[PDB]
Every structure is written in C-alpha cells, then in structure tokens.
Amino acid sequence: IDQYMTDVGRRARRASRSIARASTAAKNAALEAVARAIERDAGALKAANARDVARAKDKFVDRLTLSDKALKTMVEGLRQVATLPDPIGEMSNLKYRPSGIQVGQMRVPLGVIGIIYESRPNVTIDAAALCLKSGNATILRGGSEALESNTALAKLIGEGLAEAGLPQDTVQVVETADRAAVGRLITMTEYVDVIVPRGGKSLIERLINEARVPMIKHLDGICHVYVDDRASVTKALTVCDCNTMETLLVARGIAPAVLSPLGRLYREKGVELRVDADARAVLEAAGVGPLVDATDEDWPVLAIKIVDGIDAAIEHINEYGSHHTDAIVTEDHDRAMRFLREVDSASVMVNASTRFADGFEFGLGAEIGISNDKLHARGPVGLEGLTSLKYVVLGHGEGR
Amino acid sequence: DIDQYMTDVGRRARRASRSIARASTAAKNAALEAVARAIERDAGALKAANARDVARAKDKGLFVDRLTLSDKALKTMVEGLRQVATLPDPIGEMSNLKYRPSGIQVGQMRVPLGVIGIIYESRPNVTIDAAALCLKSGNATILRGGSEALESNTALAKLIGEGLAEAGLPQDTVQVVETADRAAVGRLITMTEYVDVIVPRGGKSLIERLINEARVPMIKHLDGICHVYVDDRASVTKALTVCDCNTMETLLVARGIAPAVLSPLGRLYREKGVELRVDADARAVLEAAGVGPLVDAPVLAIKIVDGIDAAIEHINEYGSHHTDAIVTEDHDRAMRFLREVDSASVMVNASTRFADGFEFGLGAEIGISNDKLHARGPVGLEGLTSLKYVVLGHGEGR
Amino acid sequence: DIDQYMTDVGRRARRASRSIARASTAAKNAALEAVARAIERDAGALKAANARDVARAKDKGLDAAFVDRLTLSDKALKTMVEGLRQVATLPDPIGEMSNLKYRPSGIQVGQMRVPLGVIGIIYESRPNVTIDAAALCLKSGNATILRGGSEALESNTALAKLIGEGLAEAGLPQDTVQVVETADRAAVGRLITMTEYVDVIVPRGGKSLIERLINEARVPMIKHLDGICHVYVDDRASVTKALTVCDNCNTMETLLVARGIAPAVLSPLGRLYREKGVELRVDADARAVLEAAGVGPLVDATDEDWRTEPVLAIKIVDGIDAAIEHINEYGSHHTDAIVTEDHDRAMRFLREVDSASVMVNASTRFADGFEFGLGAEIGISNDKLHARGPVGLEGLTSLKYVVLGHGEGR
Amino acid sequence: DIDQYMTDVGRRARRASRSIARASTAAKNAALEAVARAIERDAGALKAANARDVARDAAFVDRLTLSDKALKTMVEGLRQVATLPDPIGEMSNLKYRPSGIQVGQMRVPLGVIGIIYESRPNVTIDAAALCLKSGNATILRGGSEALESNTALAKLIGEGLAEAGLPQDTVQVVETADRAAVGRLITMTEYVDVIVPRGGKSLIERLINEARVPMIKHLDGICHVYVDDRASVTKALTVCDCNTMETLLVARGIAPAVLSPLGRLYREKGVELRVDADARAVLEAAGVGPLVDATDEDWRTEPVLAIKIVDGIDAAIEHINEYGSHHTDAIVTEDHDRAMRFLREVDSASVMVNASTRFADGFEFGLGAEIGISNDKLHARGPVGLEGLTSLKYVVLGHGEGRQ
Numbered sequence A: 001i002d003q004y005m006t007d008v009g010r011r012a013r014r015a016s017r018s019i020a021r022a023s024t025a026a027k028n029a030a031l032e033a034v035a036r037a038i039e040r041d042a043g044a045l046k047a048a049n050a051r052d053v054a055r056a057k058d059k060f061v062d063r064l065t066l067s068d069k070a071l072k073t074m075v076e077g078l079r080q081v082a083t084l085p086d087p088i089g090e091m092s093n094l095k096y097r098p099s100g101i102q103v104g105q106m107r108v109p110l111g112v113i114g115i116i117y118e119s120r121p122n123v124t125i126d127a128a129a130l131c132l133k134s135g136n137a138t139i140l141r142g143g144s145e146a147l148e149s150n151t152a153l154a155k156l157i158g159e160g161l162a163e164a165g166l167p168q169d170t171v172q173v174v175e176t177a178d179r180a181a182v183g184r185l186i187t188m189t190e191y192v193d194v195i196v197p198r199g200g201k202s203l204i205e206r207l208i209n210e211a212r213v214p215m216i217k218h219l220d221g222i223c224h225v226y227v228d229d230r231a232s233v234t235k236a237l238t239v240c241d242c243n244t245m246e247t248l249l250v251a252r253g254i255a256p257a258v259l260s261p262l263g264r265l266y267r268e269k270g271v272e273l274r275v276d277a278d279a280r281a282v283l284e285a286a287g288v289g290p291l292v293d294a295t296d297e298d299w300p301v302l303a304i305k306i307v308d309g310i311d312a313a314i315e316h317i318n319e320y321g322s323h324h325t326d327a328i329v330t331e332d333h334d335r336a337m338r339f340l341r342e343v344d345s346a347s348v349m350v351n352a353s354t355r356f357a358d359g360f361e362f363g364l365g366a367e368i369g370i371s372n373d374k375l376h377a378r379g380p381v382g383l384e385g386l387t388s389l390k391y392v393v394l395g396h397g398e399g400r
Numbered sequence B: 001d002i003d004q005y006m007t008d009v010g011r012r013a014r015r016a017s018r019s020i021a022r023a024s025t026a027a028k029n030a031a032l033e034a035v036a037r038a039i040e041r042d043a044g045a046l047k048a049a050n051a052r053d054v055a056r057a058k059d060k061g062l063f064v065d066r067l068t069l070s071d072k073a074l075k076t077m078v079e080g081l082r083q084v085a086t087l088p089d090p091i092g093e094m095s096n097l098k099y100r101p102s103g104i105q106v107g108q109m110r111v112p113l114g115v116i117g118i119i120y121e122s123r124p125n126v127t128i129d130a131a132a133l134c135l136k137s138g139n140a141t142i143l144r145g146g147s148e149a150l151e152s153n154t155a156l157a158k159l160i161g162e163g164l165a166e167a168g169l170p171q172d173t174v175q176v177v178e179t180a181d182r183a184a185v186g187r188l189i190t191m192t193e194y195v196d197v198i199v200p201r202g203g204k205s206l207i208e209r210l211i212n213e214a215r216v217p218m219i220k221h222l223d224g225i226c227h228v229y230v231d232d233r234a235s236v237t238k239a240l241t242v243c244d245c246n247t248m249e250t251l252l253v254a255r256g257i258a259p260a261v262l263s264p265l266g267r268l269y270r271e272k273g274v275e276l277r278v279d280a281d282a283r284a285v286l287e288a289a290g291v292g293p294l295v296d297a298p299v300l301a302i303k304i305v306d307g308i309d310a311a312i313e314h315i316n317e318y319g320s321h322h323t324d325a326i327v328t329e330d331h332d333r334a335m336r337f338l339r340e341v342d343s344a345s346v347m348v349n350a351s352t353r354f355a356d357g358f359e360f361g362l363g364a365e366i367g368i369s370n371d372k373l374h375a376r377g378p379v380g381l382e383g384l385t386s387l388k389y390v391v392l393g394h395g396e397g398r
Numbered sequence C: 001d002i003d004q005y006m007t008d009v010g011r012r013a014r015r016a017s018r019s020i021a022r023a024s025t026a027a028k029n030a031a032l033e034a035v036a037r038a039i040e041r042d043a044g045a046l047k048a049a050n051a052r053d054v055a056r057a058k059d060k061g062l063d064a065a066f067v068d069r070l071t072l073s074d075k076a077l078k079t080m081v082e083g084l085r086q087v088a089t090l091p092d093p094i095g096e097m098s099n100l101k102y103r104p105s106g107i108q109v110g111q112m113r114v115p116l117g118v119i120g121i122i123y124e125s126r127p128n129v130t131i132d133a134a135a136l137c138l139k140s141g142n143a144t145i146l147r148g149g150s151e152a153l154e155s156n157t158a159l160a161k162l163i164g165e166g167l168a169e170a171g172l173p174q175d176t177v178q179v180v181e182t183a184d185r186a187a188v189g190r191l192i193t194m195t196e197y198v199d200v201i202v203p204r205g206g207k208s209l210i211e212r213l214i215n216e217a218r219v220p221m222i223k224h225l226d227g228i229c230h231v232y233v234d235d236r237a238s239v240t241k242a243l244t245v246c247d248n249c250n251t252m253e254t255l256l257v258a259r260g261i262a263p264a265v266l267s268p269l270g271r272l273y274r275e276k277g278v279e280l281r282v283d284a285d286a287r288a289v290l291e292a293a294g295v296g297p298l299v300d301a302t303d304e305d306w307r308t309e310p311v312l313a314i315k316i317v318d319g320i321d322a323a324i325e326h327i328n329e330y331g332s333h334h335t336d337a338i339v340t341e342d343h344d345r346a347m348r349f350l351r352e353v354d355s356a357s358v359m360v361n362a363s364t365r366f367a368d369g370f371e372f373g374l375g376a377e378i379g380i381s382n383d384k385l386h387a388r389g390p391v392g393l394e395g396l397t398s399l400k401y402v403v404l405g406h407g408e409g410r
Numbered sequence D: 001d002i003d004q005y006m007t008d009v010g011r012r013a014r015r016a017s018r019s020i021a022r023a024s025t026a027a028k029n030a031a032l033e034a035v036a037r038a039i040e041r042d043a044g045a046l047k048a049a050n051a052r053d054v055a056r057d058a059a060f061v062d063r064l065t066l067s068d069k070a071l072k073t074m075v076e077g078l079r080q081v082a083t084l085p086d087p088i089g090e091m092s093n094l095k096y097r098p099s100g101i102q103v104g105q106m107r108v109p110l111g112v113i114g115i116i117y118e119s120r121p122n123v124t125i126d127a128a129a130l131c132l133k134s135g136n137a138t139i140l141r142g143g144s145e146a147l148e149s150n151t152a153l154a155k156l157i158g159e160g161l162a163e164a165g166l167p168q169d170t171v172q173v174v175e176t177a178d179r180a181a182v183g184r185l186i187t188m189t190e191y192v193d194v195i196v197p198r199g200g201k202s203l204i205e206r207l208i209n210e211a212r213v214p215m216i217k218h219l220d221g222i223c224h225v226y227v228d229d230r231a232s233v234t235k236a237l238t239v240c241d242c243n244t245m246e247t248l249l250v251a252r253g254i255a256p257a258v259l260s261p262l263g264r265l266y267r268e269k270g271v272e273l274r275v276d277a278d279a280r281a282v283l284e285a286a287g288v289g290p291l292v293d294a295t296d297e298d299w300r301t302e303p304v305l306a307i308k309i310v311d312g313i314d315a316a317i318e319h320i321n322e323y324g325s326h327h328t329d330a331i332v333t334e335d336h337d338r339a340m341r342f343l344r345e346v347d348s349a350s351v352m353v354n355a356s357t358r359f360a361d362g363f364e365f366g367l368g369a370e371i372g373i374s375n376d377k378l379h380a381r382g383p384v385g386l387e388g389l390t391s392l393k394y395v396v397l398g399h400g401e402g403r404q
Helices: A002-021 A024-040 A042-057 A068-083 A123-133 A144-164 A180-185 A201-210 A233-240 A252-268 A277-285 A310-320 A333-342 B002-022 B025-039 B043-058 B071-086 B125-136 B147-166 B183-188 B204-213 B236-242 B255-270 B280-288 B308-318 B331-340 C002-022 C025-041 C043-060 C064-070 C074-089 C129-139 C150-169 C186-191 C207-216 C239-247 C259-274 C284-293 C303-307 C320-330 C343-352 D002-022 D025-041 D043-054 D060-064 D070-083 D121-133 D144-163 D180-185 D201-210 D233-239 D252-268 D277-285 D313-323 D336-345
Strands: A091-096 A102-109 A112-117 A137-141 A171-173 A194-198 A223-227 A245-251 A272-275 A301-307 A325-329 A347-352 A369-371 A379-381 A387-398 B094-099 B105-112 B115-119 B140-144 B174-176 B197-200 B227-230 B250-254 B275-278 B299-305 B323-327 B345-350 B367-369 B377-379 B385-396 C097-102 C108-115 C118-123 C143-148 C177-179 C200-204 C229-233 C252-258 C279-282 C311-317 C335-339 C357-362 C379-381 C389-391 C397-408 D091-096 D102-109 D112-116 D137-141 D171-173 D194-197 D224-227 D247-251 D272-275 D304-310 D328-332 D350-355 D372-374 D382-384 D390-401
Touching (some): A002 A102, A002 A137, A002 A180, A002 B331, A024 A042, A024 A068, A024 A123, A042 A068, A042 A144, A091 A387, A112 A123, A112 A180, A123 A137, A123 A144, A123 A194, A137 A180, A144 A171, A194 A201, A194 A369, A223 A233, A223 A310, A233 A252, A233 A325, A233 A347, A233 B385, A245 A252, A245 A310, A252 A272, A252 A277, A252 A301, A277 A301, A301 A310, A310 A325, A310 A333, A325 A333, A333 A347, A333 B002, A333 B105, A333 D336, A379 B385, A387 B236, B002 B105, B002 B115, B002 B140, B002 B174, B002 B183, B025 B071, B025 B125, B025 B147, B043 B071, B043 B147, B071 B125, B094 B385, B115 B125, B115 B183, B125 B140, B125 B147, B125 B174, B140 B183, B147 B174, B197 B204, B227 B255, B236 B255, B236 B323, B236 B345, B250 B255, B255 B280, B255 B299, B275 B280, B280 B299, B299 B308, B308 B323, B308 B331, B323 B331, B331 B345, B331 C343, C002 C108, C002 C118, C002 C177, C002 C186, C002 D336, C025 C129, C025 C150, C043 C064, C043 C074, C074 C129, C097 C397, C108 D336, C118 C129, C118 C186, C129 C143, C129 C150, C129 C177, C143 C150, C143 C186, C200 C207, C229 C239, C239 C335, C239 C357, C239 D390, C252 C259, C252 C320, C259 C279, C259 C284, C259 C311, C279 C284, C284 C311, C303 C311, C303 C320, C311 C320, C320 C343, C335 C343, C343 C357, C343 D002, C343 D102, C397 D233, C397 D382, D002 D102, D002 D112, D002 D137, D002 D171, D002 D180, D025 D043, D025 D070, D025 D144, D043 D060, D043 D070, D043 D144, D060 D144, D112 D121, D121 D137, D121 D144, D121 D171, D194 D201, D224 D313, D233 D252, D233 D328, D247 D252, D252 D272, D252 D277, D252 D304, D272 D277, D277 D304, D304 D313, D313 D328, D313 D336, D328 D336, D336 D350
Parallel strands (some): A112 A137, A137 A171, A223 A245, A223 A325, A245 A301, A272 A301, A325 A347, A387 B345, B115 B140, B115 B197, B140 B174, B227 B250, B227 B323, B250 B299, B275 B299, B323 B345, C143 C177, C229 C252, C229 C335, C252 C311, C279 C311, C335 C357, C397 D350, D112 D137, D112 D194, D137 D171, D224 D247, D224 D328, D247 D304, D272 D304, D328 D350
Antiparallel strands (some): A091 A102, A102 A387, A369 A379, B094 B105, B094 C097, B105 B385, B367 B377, C097 C108, C108 C397, C379 C389, D091 D102, D372 D382
C-alpha cells in the first residue's frame, strides 16, 4: 500500500507537466464538458447518491445529499470557474536592471494538490475544477460514506479530461479505503505541494499534528465583533445582526445603549446569550433574558463580554480569537484604522458584518477554502492560492 | 530549564511583536541607525569578544576568517544596517481597495509575520544582517547563531538592544539565544504558538536535519544542481559570456551545437582549474577538441542532450528548482523554457549567477527559496510579511 | 443663446457629475439594467422610429455605409442590450484606492481612481452610440453630454428618453445624461471649447468629422485619426506564421517584407490576396518578386501609398532596422506587428516601434478592446498621453493622490 | 531664421529620441554621472558665465546666482536621478487570452519633452536629467536672463552625452532669447510630445490659450484646509501651521475652539487675516487682530490667509470644488466617514486627511523626483515624477494566431 500511494504521487507529478502546459481554451473545454456530463447523468447521479444517502441514514448527512439544487450548483460552479481568468503563464513587473537583464515574475501552478474530504461529494467536482483551471494535477481522497457518489463524479471528470485531450492522471482518486493512505499522502512531500482539507475539526486536528505537506485550511473560527464606545448604535445593530460572529465585545461606555437593543434583537431570534458578569448586569437592567453565565472556555449561541475599550478589545481578539475574521464598529477614524492594522486576523473589518469574509463577497469569484495562516494564502482563497510566483529573466547574454 | 528558557523567549518574542508591528517607519529606521553608531567606536568590546571566539576556535581548528570580525567586516556590517534603513517600509501598505456591489470596500494590507526565527552558522555578521531585515519588516526576531560565534553574537545582541532602546522599541524585539546547547534548535523549530517562520542558513546536513524535525514553516534552500542549457539555436558568443548556490553545476548542451560550443567552453573552464565531469558524448566531443583531462560521470558536470524537450525534462527531474537558464536565439524556445522549467528563477541568455536579491532589485536578501509557496527565489523584506484582507464598510450586514 | 444654452448644459453636467461620482456600484448597475429592460420593452417602437430615420435618409440619397450604420435591426438592438449588461457586469472602477504606503514623515500616501467628471460624446449616424457611450461613461461615474447627428434624430431621441427612464429608476439625476437638442452646427464648436465644463471628448464618426475637431477642439479628445497599420515579415519569420498572420483601423494597410524572405513569402501571399480581389500596390522590388512568381496584376506604389488609408501596399526592406524606421515614420502609431522567430528581433520590435499596440507573431486585428480583455471599448487611441490603444472604462477615469495622515505638519 | 532654427531643433529632437529611447539603464546613468563630473571640472568657466549673467530686481538675482551651494545641489541631483530605477521598457500584466495570444503593456518614453522655464539655471540640469533618465529627448527654453549660463550648462550636458555614446541632440538648449521660440515650441505638434512649463500664472495662462502641444502644468490657485466640527484641536493646530494653504475653512461648531489659538499663531507669524463676517466675530471675541474683511474675490485669489466659516463638510467640499485650484486640499477630522467622504468627493490632485497640504510634493510622496506639479485630470495629476514623462502601450506575445 506504500507503493500504491508512491505510484499515485509519481503519476501526479508527471501529469502535472501536461496540465501546466494546457491552454486556457483546453482547460475551459474540460470544465464545460464535465458540466454537460452532469446535466446528462443527473438521474444516474441522483440515483447513485440516493444509494449513498440511504446507507448513511442506516447508521452531515445533509451535506452528503445531492438534490437537484446541489447538482445545479455544481454545474453552475463549473461554468463560473471556466468564466474566471486563466491565471497561469502571466508575467508581471518585468523591469530592466542596471546590469542589463530584465527581471520579473511568472505565475505558474503549484503542480500537485491533494484534496482530503469527508462527506461533501460535491468537493469532488468543486475542488478538482479549481485545481484544474489553475493548471494543477489533483489527488482526490474522499470518505467511505460517499464512495458511489465520488466514484461517479470522478468518472465524469475523466470524461471531461478525455474530451479536452488531457491525461486521465490530471485527476487521480485514491481508490482504496485503507487507513494509512492519508498518512502517506500528507507526508508525500516529493510529489504533493499542498493539501486542502474539507472536513471537520477532528480530521483537521489530525492533519495539523501529522502532515508534513503544507496545508491551506482554517481550524474552525472564533470571530469577534467589537462595538467601540464611539460606535454608531445604528451601524452596530445592522452589523451585529465559519465566519459567523461567536463573540460580541462591547466597550463599557456604550454597553447600555448597545446591549439593550442588541440583546433584545438576538433574544427574539432564539439566540442563547452567554455573558460575563458585567454584560449580565447591563442586560438584566435592560430587562433582556434569560442569560447564561459565561466561563473562560466560552472565549445559535452568542458570547458577550464587556471590555474597557479598543486596547483591551484588540488584545482579547489577538489572544483568544482564531485570526479568521474580526470587525470593529466605530465612527472614530484613528480607531478604525488602528483596528485594521493591529488585529492580526485573515480578514479585518470596519463597520461591516463578519459574514462578508468569503471569496465571492471579496470578488475572488471562487473559494477553495479559507485560510487563517500567515504564509502564502490568507483569508478566503481563490485560484491564485493554487499558484506560485517564480522569477523569470529576459537576458541578452549578460555574464556574472 | 532549557525548555522553560526557550518558552520564555517565545512568549517574549510574541509580546514584543505587537510593538514592532506598530512601530513607525522613522522609529524602525532610527533603531537601525542607532545600532550602526553603537557598533562604531564600541567596536572594541565586539572585537575583544570575537577574539575570544576566534581563539577558542583555533584551539580546535579550521572557517576562522568567516568567524573573524575584521575592521572590514564591521564596516560592511554598518553599511548594511544603513542600506536596510534606506529601504522602503512595506508594513501597513494597503492595496487594491475596491468597492463591491454589496457596498463594502475590500482590499489587502501588508503586515509583519510577527516572529521570525533565524538559525545560522558562525558568521557573526548574519546576526546584524538578519535582525535588520526582520526589524525593518516590523517583526520580532529570535536568533540562534553558531556556537563558535556565541560571544561575538552575544556582544552584537547588546548593541542591538541599545539601538532599540534609543528608538523607544522594546528590548525583546530582538533576542539572541544565549546558550550553545543545540537542543535549543529543536525547541525553536517546534514552537508553533510563538514563531511564525524559520529562516535557516548553512550546509545541506544542517538544513536536512532541520527539515524533518521542524513544525514551524521554513523559508529555505535545499541545495542541488543549477543548470545552463545551451540550445542548438544558441549564440556561441552569448553561451561563452553566459556560461562563464546559484553557480552552474551542470552544463547541458544540445547535440547539434556541441562541437562548436564545448570546444571553447571546455577551454574556458579548464583554464581555471575547474574539473570536467562528462558523459560519454561530451567526452568524445571534448577529446576531439583537444580538451582534457576528463572525468567520467570547483567542478562542472557536462551532458549532451538531444534538444530542448530533453533539457526541460532533465532539469525538472534532476535539478534543485533553484536557478536554471537557457541559451537560445529562438523566441518560442526561450518563452517555453521560461514557462515550463519549474525553477524559482528561470533565465533566457543570462548567467544563473544573477539569481540574487540585489541583482533582482530587492535591495536585500534574507535568503533564497526553492519552495513553491509564499516566497520563491531570492527573498527580500516582503518574504517576512503577510497579506491580510481589510474591509472599509459603512454599516453593511449580510 | 446657443452660448447661453450650451453653458447651461455644461453647468448642469458639472452639477450632475457630483451625484454620479458618488453613486454606488449598485445604483449604477441598476440604471444600466433598467435601460436594458426598457430597450427590450420598446424594441418594436424603437425599430419603428429608426425606420423613419432610415427612410428619410435613403431619400436624401446618403452613403449606403452611412445608412447601414444608421440602421437599428433586431441584431443591433439585441447587441446594445448585451452591451448594457456587459457594462453592468464589469467591475466598478470608481473609488478604488491603491498603493497606500507609509512615508518616513508618518503620512500614508496612495492614489484613488475617480471619474473624469463630464464626457462629451460627438457622433454621426450610429444611434446605438447613444446607449453604448452613455453606458460606459455612467458606469465610470461620469456625467455625459451627447451630441448625435441630425439624420438619427428620431432614434437618438427615443433612446435617450429610455436612458432617462433608467436614471430615474435608479435614483440618479436626469442630468447625468444630457442630449444637445438643437441641430444648430454652432453647438459642436461650443462643446469642444467648453473647457470649464467638459473634461474629455470622444468623437465617433469618420476622418471628415475628426479632422474638424482635431483642428478646433480645446477640450482634450480620446480618438485616432486613420489606421495605417503594418505587418513586417522578418527574414527569420516562420513562413507558416507569416501566412496565418498576414492573411488575417486594425487591418494591415501595408506589408513589409525582408529582402531575404520575399520570394518565399510574397509568392503565396500575393496569390492569396489576388484570390481575394485585393489591389496590390508595390514598390519596384516587390514587383519583380511578384512578377517572377506570376502574381498579377500589380499597380506601382507611390510614396503617398505609404501614408494612405481593398488595397494593400507592399514594400521590400533590408531588415528590421529599415522596417522599424518605416513604421515609425509613415505609420499611424495604431497597431503594428512583426513576424519573426528570432527572440532579440521580436523584443527590439516591441520596444522600438512607437505604436499603441505592438505585436509579435499575431494579426494586427487582435488590437481591440475585447480581444485585450478590457471588456469594453470607448475607442482606440493612437495618442501617447493618458490612454493609448483600445480604451476601456479606465480611460474615462483619473488617478489622484489621497493621504491618510495623523496630524503631521511640515 | 528663428523659425527655420526651431523647426530644425524639433527635427533633431525627433531623430535623437530613437537613440535615447533605446538606451540602456547603464548608458543613461553614465550620461548623468558624466554631466555631474563635467560640471565639477569646468566649474570656473561656468561660474564666469553666470557672473556675466548675474550682472546683466530681487531676489531674482539670488535665484539666478549659481552659488557654490547650488552647484553642489545640482551635481547631487544628477547622481540622485541616477539612483532612481529605470522606468523604461518595463512590461506588466502580460496575461494569456482565450484566443491564445498574450497581451500586456510596456512603459515607454513620450519621445520629446519641451521644457519652458524661468531664470533659474538649475532647472536646465534638473529637468534635462529627469527627461534623459526617462528615455526622452529634451528641448529646453529657459529664461533670457540666464541665457549665457544655460549655454554654459548645455555644453557640459553635451560632454556627458558624448561620454555615454549618446547623441548630442538628446538635449538641446534654445540658443536665443527671441521669445518667438516659445510660440513655436508650444505648437510643434510634429516634433514635441508634451510641454512642462514652469513659472508664474501669467505665463502659464498665455501658454494654455496658445499651446497645441499638450502640457503637464498647474494653473496656480487656492489650496484649502477644512477644519471639521469633529476635528482634534491638537491636529488642527499642527496641520494648519506650491501647496501652501491660502484659505482656511472652519466649521461653525468648532470655530471658537480652533480659530482662537490658530489666529494667535498666525498673527505672531505675521500673516494678514482676511476674514468673512462670522470669523470676524469669533476672532474679535478672542482678541485676535487686526482683521481685514474678506472679499468674494479673496476665495479665488492667491502672506495672507483667507478664513471662512462654513456649516459643515457638505458646504466645505462644495466651496473647495467651486473655488479651489484642484491642487491640494485637506480635512481635519476625527470622524471616519467624513474623512473618507472628503478623500472621495474633493476633486483635487492631492486630497489629505489630517495632514498639511505642504506634503503635496514629489519627494514627500515617494516619487524621488518632481518634474512639476499637475492639477489636470488626464495623464498625470499631483506631483509628477519620471512616470509622467512616459506612456503605456500594448504589447502582444503571439504564436502565429490569425484573426480576420
């Protein structure tokens, strides 16, 4: 089994040369072909998925189901990626140096992307589409609980690859169900350049401890909205109504004015409120309840904490948060800009809902995942996250 | 005790990072200038300490010139600090702030990574050079230098601390590991809570041991072959000027042009005492050119290849993906080589030796990367930074 | 009163530009989509209005090409509608901030992209310009002043009323788009001199109208007088590439061929062009080459042929230096191409040929806003300043510096 | 003869422009360094011409005087221009298109730059240095009262060019005071691509109405600082202490808190205060004087400070866009939305939040140069550096693709 994965790795590396070379038109043609194939086998796909969904119930299961609406979404997603600009081969900043050479960078694919996913058989299409368009070979590793759906989709990918003239190995499915496959895959550093997990925190914690191949991922997010004492209450109500706020931080000076309509609005929608001692007093005096005591671990449910002001807010966020998405509500210009600069999170917001931190809202036109890491790709990740910049030199015979 | 120490250093770096990330351009540049002055006319303590390192070394042997802080080394070191001060501050820069249909305005801000760990050999100069770059890019630094340079590096750390204090920055912005115990290295590269990236420099054996023990990501160069491929449509003249870490280790020559090219190239190299390791075809061409002696397989490997397709395959298979070049006058082949050669720097008609932070216009070189993610090729200030998203909103909810 | 009238239009345009410059992306796109649906709605009525214009036109016996450009068929209409939704789809360029960098002094300085303000559009025939130009101006946050020709009166009027419908539907001031209503020829002269109120002018007509504006305008223009475009076939050209590129404004008016490759290239190219009914105007050397190959008939080229304009001028040159000099001397600096396999020659040509678009091994017919990825085309510019080549939304915007300070004094 | 001479000058500039556009970074920087050494060697023969010029008002004579501090500054400038990156020939955004072609842009020189300037001999060198560095040929018409010194500088620029192997005609200085040269230069559309005029508003205004060649210029006028009612008084004082503030706009609500310490500051520094009725009342209540009644003309006409009270930001923005020269204008405010609004809506070349208008400057903005300042909308706006003397054209890297 350690020779099978090695073989998969070798074939990926070799396939990666072909897809790297493939023109914009060929890649888009592959994608459109996979799209039409799905429109064609809608029934067989709906049928196969049902077999999977039935054995599922017979022992999340939502995210496993391919409704007519999910297929439509996968197809529409294929055509979106086709519509996206082809980022490969682009040259930038080709400047002359005193020495005579001209130096710039080229955007090229990473090469080989490993996708490890649980349920979510749509990942089979959505992940591979993005990798393919960005010129990479893809290694797919789904979960047992979706064998037939993934197998069926992976064959349609191959059909699209065949239609475009591309090698079948442009997309490989790890066919086994053997446990040690993932262990080998996340350690296959010669042949795999990055892993994109699409599972729960349980799997993501395993990979974090074990993987030697770099990953694009976020350990599930604790996100904050800090309501400053120079907040507009009106903005705070609109704004505060993986990137969903889990903790509301409110400056002491404005808590009564803000927490009264906020807590009341949240209560009416059925949200449980976990509050620190100060917030409890503010909410009780406003007649808003019931309320649950917040523990230190707390840092359909919302945690609420009172802070002295912006210094304590930034410090709490950088210390306890997941560095995913965090927002400030304030009318004070310097405090707004300070927050943007100092809050060390993947996306930082002034007077806007934390829900806006996703690839489509941000204009990336896609989202392979969301990264809370500092290096390479951070925040919502689009096509570019699956590419690299190398230096290219237009010379004229210069020696050194 | 040594775990407790490295943990403490970690926590201190993380805490200091908030201040240095907040620091103004003027304050960081002032810090650099103060360290420069503090090295000037306080060079005596520096030299005395270095003398002790150099003496403990000789009484063991070998390297000593690399370890030695001559007047020249200090002059270079001081000039470098000032050069780093002249570099534009990349921190806090906002770019591509665009309105979206939803009404929000979304762009990116360049920010420091936070804490950089630097691991190096026994050239004391690196202490100042690496720290200058990390500091200018708004990061806290932890430095572990070679154990044979420990007293020099400790003496340099004190001057850095004084410069920092003069500019109102905290002492812990820069920390030099005060122990020679190598177990500190294992700690530093596994300290993921507190350290954001490791920048290791040194030989392959060091780099290799670091690679399979580290859990903190690294910006590094795992050494190996750099190539120059001389195409059959090469200009012989350009081949001679071009082909004379980023040094050409292997020469690949297209079959069609081998006699015309290997004859003068072989002489060029044999007239510098460079050894020629040759495959069978190259041996034949070189013997017929009267160029020897030759060794079968300061050294150059030489191989005959059929043409460009084989060259690209060879380089992508056998090379270190560091620096590789083609000599050709053919436009499509030049562009193909640039696109398909999967190296950190790829060149058309230029020496692989140009793959350098200063040659490339970065004004700095913290290191070289043959990695694909984050930073690739020679790495300057930007490699010690991150891009995050920033949103200028107006109260929008989704 | 033409002065009173036109000055009033200018002040109204300035006032309205303030609103449209502030307009959110959503409001601008809603305005475009409204106009598009409105055209879909009144398609029959618009075609009926256009037929009255065409009938009145063919009565005067106007140039068939002028009349064919006047004609709004279903295809033209659908095409305008597509254009509206294309423009709505384009990213909103306005208000974007870039390169906001800290300086040693402590300030942070960058640039903001903003609208020019007020755009004057002057057009003959082509009633579709009423919609297409207004759309681009509007999306880029500008006020527009439209001056269309007399022969499209009913069409332009109908189309502009629909624009107004869209403005109102999106909450934009009606004066965001104004039409110059009088046919008085004096209005054009005022418009191109109304330097206080109009920031740039985009003319779309022939070389007849452009000539007047060029000599009379004081307001800056985005335009191109004539397209004398070249393909130079280097002696190191791939013959195959030469054949594909040279067979394929924008169109090759002059073919330059290196002496060394002329028999290999001109012989199949000359035959190819004559099998298309293209007149070949040739220099002495190309004539001998073509006569040699049996390609005919041929007209002698005059030196005015190198500066003129189904006719193709052919000239033999020694090589790339002669070719570059000829292009820079006689060309219109619009679009020019080299066919060569030699890398250094290819890069020299890109560098030294002072045209708006320079091509290596590609047909000059690719020099085009859509082919270039601009997603739009307000016009093609052969000027050096501000906008050059095909011009998209950004051509109708300006960059200004913006500074985020902290109380710094100097 | 003046006419034949000017045409010849144009033709030579066009011919030279090919060589300089092509010239490498090394050759251009070497020309610069060579000029800088030729000034160091022929300094005596140079300072003598200046003397025979300075002899032949005030402080016209000081600005005209090639002091041994201006010759250092001029020489340092050459070397400074040499350190600047070479903007020329850069290719950017070379992207593949679905058709298979690859399309990007290349930055190239405008070609031939006309420089028209006063009797400050340093401009001769400064402006030529910038034009040369950016790959352009230059034609310089300086003040007639510096004609001998500029003729002296011309010979030395010539030296530098020759050393570098660049054509002499890369830089031509007009060898006559005949003002007809100016009329020709600003109409030489065949040979000159842009004019960079530098002087007083009168001259600039003539050129504007007469020039057919495009210009990078600024028609001087009012720059404003608006102090909003949510301004920090502290920031207002440091901020409110050719981009000089000619008019101060103060929100009615903050006027006594700001105008009182500010007025005192100005009066101590000797500034005439021309005030509207409302500012009069506030300043007089604060014991600041004397004051002069502002006219309606004072809001349009450029040591005086004009001070106006406005209701708030809407009235300020409107006043600035109406009366200003669209050069540089600033807001002092702590309110985020108001700060961003001002940046967006104030249609000036440089707009500032909580920073002095005096920062509107090429060096302050990081351009490393200033060929001039522009308050026009097209091409170049604000302080103009090397890039303003360049153009972007499209370049296509193709593979033999056809399209009919």
